[PDB]
Amino acid sequence: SLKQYLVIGRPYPTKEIPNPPAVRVQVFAPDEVIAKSKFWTVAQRIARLKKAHGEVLAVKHVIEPEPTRVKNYGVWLSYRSTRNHHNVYKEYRDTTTEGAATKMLAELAGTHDVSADNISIIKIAEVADKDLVHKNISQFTHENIKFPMLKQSIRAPTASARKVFAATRPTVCGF
RNA sequence: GAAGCGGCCACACCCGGCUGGCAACAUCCAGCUCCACUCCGAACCUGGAAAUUAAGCAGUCGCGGGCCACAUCAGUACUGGGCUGGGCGACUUCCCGGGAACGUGCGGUGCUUGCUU
């Protein structure tokens, strides 16, 4: 699964300019090798720094201070569809920044039908309950939340104990 | 510094100003022979040296035209590989590589080969 990464890179020393500016990029990738390639894509596209003349100094893996508790996450992104580019601010409720970013790649591929090639994120950050403005996620920050589990599952409690017959009929009611 | 002989052949060209002539280059003065104008000593040619730096030439100036140089322009345009990627199609995301031009910004405007007073 995706892991947040911070990558810092720089161009090689020329004799004209030793110690140039380095540059960092936040990237989301399954491992350290992919995170380099996402850095070289963003560095080339914007800051004009190529693979063929540049170091890459530190792939830092961002682990969470606490994954124990739930946070809100605003995600400002652009996504591209044929004939136009759209800017969207979408937000999510999750244990971590990565799990929010993994959610929206599924949600955009679901709802809008665009892949991670076309998508380009601007900003992820955690956000307080006061500044949060979207109604369907604001309801989970309130107190006294009840919802029932209408439609129970029929699965095996362990994969040994599955069966394709039954005497009694299963009840799939919420209760 | 000036002159003959040249090398790379505009950072040297083209328009217009200003400052210099000790010798040197030149304008300039004259026309008899050499010879010269399909007419003309204007040119070419020959013999001068009175007076000038006005012109050529030399140096220098211009928010000058052009030329040259670096940086931006731009990781743009285009492009070599790869996908049972997308798309009715036309075309085009993405992955591994290469990478312009015009324009604009600031700078510059000849550097010296061998012989001679």
Tab-separated table of C-alpha atoms (C1' of nucleotides) in Angstrom:
chain	number	residue	atom	x	y	z
A	1	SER	CA	0.000	0.000	0.000
A	2	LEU	CA	1.007	3.659	-0.324
A	3	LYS	CA	3.462	5.198	2.149
A	4	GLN	CA	4.056	8.939	2.502
A	5	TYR	CA	7.591	9.885	1.539
A	6	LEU	CA	9.683	13.014	1.604
A	7	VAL	CA	12.397	13.092	-1.009
A	8	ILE	CA	15.111	15.712	-1.233
A	9	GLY	CA	17.242	16.018	-4.334
A	10	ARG	CA	19.669	18.394	-6.014
A	11	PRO	CA	21.680	18.987	-9.223
A	12	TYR	CA	25.379	18.027	-9.406
A	13	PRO	CA	28.094	20.601	-8.575
A	14	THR	CA	29.262	22.508	-11.633
A	15	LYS	CA	32.487	24.536	-11.273
A	16	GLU	CA	30.275	27.618	-11.861
A	17	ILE	CA	28.072	26.788	-8.826
A	18	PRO	CA	29.063	24.305	-6.082
A	19	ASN	CA	26.378	23.854	-3.390
A	20	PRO	CA	23.199	24.530	-5.419
A	21	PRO	CA	19.639	24.615	-4.027
A	22	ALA	CA	18.248	21.179	-3.190
A	23	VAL	CA	14.484	20.585	-3.546
A	24	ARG	CA	11.989	18.330	-1.701
A	25	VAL	CA	8.775	16.632	-2.890
A	26	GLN	CA	6.054	14.859	-0.903
A	27	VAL	CA	5.240	11.617	-2.802
A	28	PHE	CA	2.966	8.599	-2.300
A	29	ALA	CA	4.228	5.184	-3.410
A	30	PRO	CA	4.419	1.528	-2.243
A	31	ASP	CA	8.226	1.537	-1.661
A	32	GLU	CA	11.490	3.548	-1.773
A	33	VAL	CA	12.267	2.692	-5.442
A	34	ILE	CA	8.951	4.063	-6.790
A	35	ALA	CA	9.235	7.169	-4.565
A	36	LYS	CA	12.471	8.159	-6.353
A	37	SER	CA	10.742	7.962	-9.749
A	38	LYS	CA	7.800	10.098	-8.581
A	39	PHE	CA	10.345	12.676	-7.333
A	40	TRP	CA	12.148	12.799	-10.707
A	41	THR	CA	8.798	13.246	-12.497
A	42	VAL	CA	7.797	16.260	-10.349
A	43	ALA	CA	11.336	17.743	-10.258
A	44	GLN	CA	11.690	17.561	-14.066
A	45	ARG	CA	8.151	18.854	-14.750
A	46	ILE	CA	8.435	21.962	-12.528
A	47	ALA	CA	11.932	22.809	-11.213
A	48	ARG	CA	13.691	21.717	-14.445
A	49	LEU	CA	15.930	19.092	-12.801
A	50	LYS	CA	16.605	15.890	-14.743
A	51	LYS	CA	17.611	12.352	-13.704
A	52	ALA	CA	20.747	12.460	-15.873
A	53	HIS	CA	22.238	15.384	-13.923
A	54	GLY	CA	21.143	15.233	-10.295
A	55	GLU	CA	21.725	13.527	-6.948
A	56	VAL	CA	18.936	12.307	-4.684
A	57	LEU	CA	19.955	12.837	-1.083
A	58	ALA	CA	17.386	11.416	1.343
A	59	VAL	CA	14.265	9.309	0.896
A	60	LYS	CA	12.657	9.892	4.313
A	61	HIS	CA	9.701	7.598	5.121
A	62	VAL	CA	7.024	9.589	7.009
A	63	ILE	CA	5.494	7.451	9.773
A	64	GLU	CA	2.604	8.932	11.798
A	65	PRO	CA	3.079	10.410	15.311
A	66	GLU	CA	-0.027	8.459	16.333
A	67	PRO	CA	-2.124	6.065	14.196
A	68	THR	CA	-4.201	5.296	17.336
A	69	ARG	CA	-6.981	7.854	16.594
A	70	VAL	CA	-9.072	9.268	13.730
A	71	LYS	CA	-8.327	12.533	11.871
A	72	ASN	CA	-10.029	14.638	9.177
A	73	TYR	CA	-8.053	15.179	5.942
A	74	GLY	CA	-8.608	17.889	3.337
A	75	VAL	CA	-7.232	16.867	-0.081
A	76	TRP	CA	-6.872	19.611	-2.712
A	77	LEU	CA	-6.249	17.964	-6.111
A	78	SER	CA	-6.469	18.441	-9.863
A	79	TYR	CA	-7.584	15.541	-12.024
A	80	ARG	CA	-7.624	15.510	-15.792
A	81	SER	CA	-10.363	14.222	-18.068
A	82	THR	CA	-10.390	14.431	-21.852
A	83	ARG	CA	-10.948	17.980	-23.090
A	84	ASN	CA	-10.611	19.576	-19.653
A	85	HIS	CA	-8.838	19.873	-16.306
A	86	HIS	CA	-10.815	20.175	-13.094
A	87	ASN	CA	-9.826	21.411	-9.649
A	88	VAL	CA	-11.512	19.772	-6.701
A	89	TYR	CA	-11.280	20.027	-2.958
A	90	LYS	CA	-12.305	16.740	-1.444
A	91	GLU	CA	-11.998	15.543	2.102
A	92	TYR	CA	-11.939	12.312	4.119
A	93	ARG	CA	-11.896	10.783	7.601
A	94	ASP	CA	-9.120	8.273	8.368
A	95	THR	CA	-6.297	7.109	10.683
A	96	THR	CA	-3.496	8.508	8.441
A	97	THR	CA	-2.585	10.730	5.454
A	98	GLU	CA	-1.772	7.684	3.285
A	99	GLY	CA	-5.122	5.980	3.926
A	100	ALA	CA	-6.888	9.212	2.944
A	101	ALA	CA	-4.843	9.373	-0.296
A	102	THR	CA	-5.537	5.662	-0.982
A	103	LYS	CA	-9.262	6.386	-0.453
A	104	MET	CA	-9.459	9.203	-3.039
A	105	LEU	CA	-7.664	7.247	-5.789
A	106	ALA	CA	-10.452	4.661	-5.389
A	107	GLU	CA	-13.145	7.375	-5.139
A	108	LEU	CA	-11.978	9.271	-8.264
A	109	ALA	CA	-11.580	5.997	-10.196
A	110	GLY	CA	-15.071	5.111	-8.934
A	111	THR	CA	-17.033	8.334	-9.214
A	112	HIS	CA	-15.295	10.300	-12.002
A	113	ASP	CA	-13.440	7.362	-13.676
A	114	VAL	CA	-9.867	8.662	-13.820
A	115	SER	CA	-6.646	6.777	-13.008
A	116	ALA	CA	-3.674	7.837	-10.852
A	117	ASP	CA	-1.749	8.796	-14.029
A	118	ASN	CA	-4.149	11.703	-14.686
A	119	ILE	CA	-4.472	12.817	-11.031
A	120	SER	CA	-2.090	15.404	-9.532
A	121	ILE	CA	-2.476	16.353	-5.837
A	122	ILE	CA	-1.840	19.935	-4.653
A	123	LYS	CA	-2.109	19.703	-0.864
A	124	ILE	CA	-2.910	17.159	1.831
A	125	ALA	CA	-3.200	18.289	5.447
A	126	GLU	CA	-5.067	17.358	8.624
A	127	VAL	CA	-7.880	19.786	9.459
A	128	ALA	CA	-9.837	20.757	12.601
A	129	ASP	CA	-13.586	20.260	13.162
A	130	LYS	CA	-14.278	24.038	13.130
A	131	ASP	CA	-12.710	24.714	9.703
A	132	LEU	CA	-14.220	21.506	8.204
A	133	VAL	CA	-16.958	22.366	5.652
A	134	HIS	CA	-18.539	19.309	4.114
A	135	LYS	CA	-21.828	17.947	5.443
A	136	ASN	CA	-21.497	14.145	5.060
A	137	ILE	CA	-18.195	14.083	7.021
A	138	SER	CA	-19.301	16.731	9.574
A	139	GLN	CA	-21.935	14.265	10.906
A	140	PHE	CA	-19.237	11.878	12.250
A	141	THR	CA	-17.619	14.679	14.312
A	142	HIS	CA	-20.898	15.177	16.266
A	143	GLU	CA	-21.867	13.325	19.453
A	144	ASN	CA	-24.658	10.719	19.736
A	145	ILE	CA	-24.050	9.022	16.368
A	146	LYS	CA	-26.220	5.960	15.898
A	147	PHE	CA	-26.480	4.057	12.679
A	148	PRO	CA	-27.677	0.438	12.415
A	149	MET	CA	-25.910	-2.345	10.524
A	150	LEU	CA	-28.729	-3.150	8.130
A	151	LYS	CA	-27.649	-5.994	5.822
A	152	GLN	CA	-25.400	-8.318	7.845
A	153	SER	CA	-22.809	-10.509	6.098
A	154	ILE	CA	-22.877	-14.257	5.608
A	155	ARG	CA	-19.206	-15.227	5.696
A	156	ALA	CA	-17.330	-18.027	7.440
A	157	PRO	CA	-16.047	-17.037	10.926
A	158	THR	CA	-13.009	-19.040	9.805
A	159	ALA	CA	-12.388	-20.318	6.246
A	160	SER	CA	-12.347	-23.925	7.536
A	161	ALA	CA	-15.977	-23.698	8.720
A	162	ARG	CA	-17.718	-22.553	5.475
A	163	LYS	CA	-20.608	-24.618	4.034
A	164	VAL	CA	-22.973	-24.735	1.005
A	165	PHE	CA	-26.032	-26.106	2.857
A	166	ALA	CA	-28.132	-25.074	5.868
A	167	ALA	CA	-31.238	-26.418	7.641
A	168	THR	CA	-32.366	-23.050	9.020
A	169	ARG	CA	-32.514	-19.877	6.918
A	170	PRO	CA	-30.055	-17.067	7.556
A	171	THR	CA	-31.442	-13.725	8.712
A	172	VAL	CA	-29.780	-10.743	7.056
A	173	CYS	CA	-31.714	-8.121	8.998
A	174	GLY	CA	-29.782	-5.365	10.697
A	175	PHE	CA	-30.887	-6.972	13.943
B	1	G	C1'	51.956	55.748	-32.723
B	2	A	C1'	52.461	55.390	-38.615
B	3	A	C1'	53.511	52.481	-43.075
B	4	G	C1'	54.105	48.200	-46.833
B	5	C	C1'	52.812	42.787	-46.402
B	6	G	C1'	49.156	39.595	-44.464
B	7	G	C1'	45.989	35.729	-40.874
B	8	C	C1'	40.665	34.611	-38.702
B	9	C	C1'	37.182	37.365	-42.442
B	10	A	C1'	31.023	42.491	-39.637
B	11	C	C1'	33.135	42.374	-31.713
B	12	A	C1'	35.855	44.459	-38.311
B	13	C	C1'	29.871	46.233	-41.837
B	14	C	C1'	26.248	50.652	-42.678
B	15	C	C1'	24.148	56.063	-41.112
B	16	G	C1'	25.742	60.461	-38.343
B	17	G	C1'	28.728	63.560	-34.659
B	18	C	C1'	33.567	65.058	-32.238
B	19	U	C1'	39.219	65.211	-31.528
B	20	G	C1'	44.252	64.652	-33.987
B	21	G	C1'	48.794	65.101	-38.404
B	22	C	C1'	56.759	65.351	-36.046
B	23	A	C1'	57.804	61.745	-39.969
B	24	A	C1'	54.415	58.323	-42.641
B	25	C	C1'	49.562	57.542	-45.520
B	26	A	C1'	46.502	61.011	-48.305
B	27	U	C1'	44.016	64.894	-50.422
B	28	C	C1'	46.397	68.186	-53.529
B	29	C	C1'	49.577	70.829	-57.872
B	30	A	C1'	51.101	70.147	-63.285
B	31	G	C1'	51.188	67.822	-68.015
B	32	C	C1'	56.711	67.195	-71.636
B	33	U	C1'	58.309	62.204	-73.044
B	34	C	C1'	56.652	56.230	-71.438
B	35	C	C1'	51.050	55.407	-72.499
B	36	A	C1'	45.613	57.027	-71.499
B	37	C	C1'	41.072	58.194	-72.614
B	38	U	C1'	35.413	53.555	-78.249
B	39	C	C1'	35.158	62.051	-76.130
B	40	C	C1'	37.838	64.258	-71.595
B	41	G	C1'	45.492	64.074	-67.826
B	42	A	C1'	38.239	62.677	-64.190
B	43	A	C1'	40.425	57.716	-64.157
B	44	C	C1'	45.081	55.206	-65.763
B	45	C	C1'	50.172	56.984	-66.403
B	46	U	C1'	54.374	60.242	-65.491
B	47	G	C1'	56.937	64.772	-62.910
B	48	G	C1'	55.883	67.582	-58.463
B	49	A	C1'	55.828	70.003	-54.086
B	50	A	C1'	52.937	75.340	-52.614
B	51	A	C1'	49.177	74.644	-48.447
B	52	U	C1'	45.796	72.040	-45.397
B	53	U	C1'	43.552	67.759	-41.764
B	54	A	C1'	37.871	69.822	-44.821
B	55	A	C1'	37.591	64.397	-46.632
B	56	G	C1'	39.986	59.313	-46.649
B	57	C	C1'	42.720	57.025	-42.629
B	58	A	C1'	43.365	56.737	-37.064
B	59	G	C1'	41.049	57.058	-32.131
B	60	U	C1'	36.179	58.012	-29.888
B	61	C	C1'	30.818	59.013	-28.839
B	62	G	C1'	25.196	57.428	-29.808
B	63	C	C1'	18.754	54.646	-24.179
B	64	G	C1'	21.792	54.309	-33.161
B	65	G	C1'	20.319	49.827	-37.453
B	66	G	C1'	22.981	45.157	-37.926
B	67	C	C1'	26.551	41.528	-36.033
B	68	C	C1'	28.607	38.656	-31.791
B	69	A	C1'	28.061	36.521	-26.593
B	70	C	C1'	25.744	34.739	-22.206
B	71	A	C1'	21.135	33.971	-19.425
B	72	U	C1'	16.076	33.328	-19.676
B	73	C	C1'	12.396	31.417	-23.254
B	74	A	C1'	11.674	25.657	-21.512
B	75	G	C1'	11.959	20.750	-19.391
B	76	U	C1'	7.615	24.110	-23.415
B	77	A	C1'	7.514	22.456	-29.007
B	78	C	C1'	9.115	18.115	-31.271
B	79	U	C1'	11.203	13.190	-30.569
B	80	G	C1'	13.832	7.368	-29.712
B	81	G	C1'	12.068	3.013	-26.959
B	82	G	C1'	7.495	0.388	-23.664
B	83	C	C1'	2.092	-0.879	-22.134
B	84	U	C1'	-4.005	-6.692	-23.280
B	85	G	C1'	-2.933	2.204	-21.347
B	86	G	C1'	-7.310	5.600	-22.827
B	87	G	C1'	-10.385	6.876	-27.281
B	88	C	C1'	-16.162	5.349	-32.047
B	89	G	C1'	-12.421	7.980	-34.282
B	90	A	C1'	-9.035	11.965	-34.820
B	91	C	C1'	-5.410	11.709	-31.594
B	92	U	C1'	-3.352	11.284	-26.689
B	93	U	C1'	-2.275	10.216	-20.658
B	94	C	C1'	1.816	7.508	-18.482
B	95	C	C1'	6.799	4.757	-17.841
B	96	C	C1'	12.659	4.553	-19.418
B	97	G	C1'	15.773	8.273	-22.601
B	98	G	C1'	17.189	12.955	-25.682
B	99	G	C1'	15.768	18.104	-26.094
B	100	A	C1'	15.069	22.997	-29.952
B	101	A	C1'	13.557	27.725	-32.324
B	102	C	C1'	11.575	32.781	-32.441
B	103	G	C1'	11.241	36.309	-28.788
B	104	U	C1'	12.789	39.094	-24.376
B	105	G	C1'	16.740	40.545	-20.802
B	106	C	C1'	21.466	42.196	-20.045
B	107	G	C1'	26.693	43.040	-22.040
B	108	G	C1'	30.381	43.903	-25.996
B	109	U	C1'	31.678	46.745	-30.913
B	110	G	C1'	38.210	44.060	-33.471
B	111	C	C1'	42.185	40.793	-31.167
B	112	U	C1'	48.050	40.713	-33.352
B	113	U	C1'	51.820	37.509	-37.475
B	114	G	C1'	56.900	38.921	-39.735
B	115	C	C1'	60.013	43.769	-41.677
B	116	U	C1'	60.783	49.422	-41.457
B	117	U	C1'	61.831	54.947	-39.298
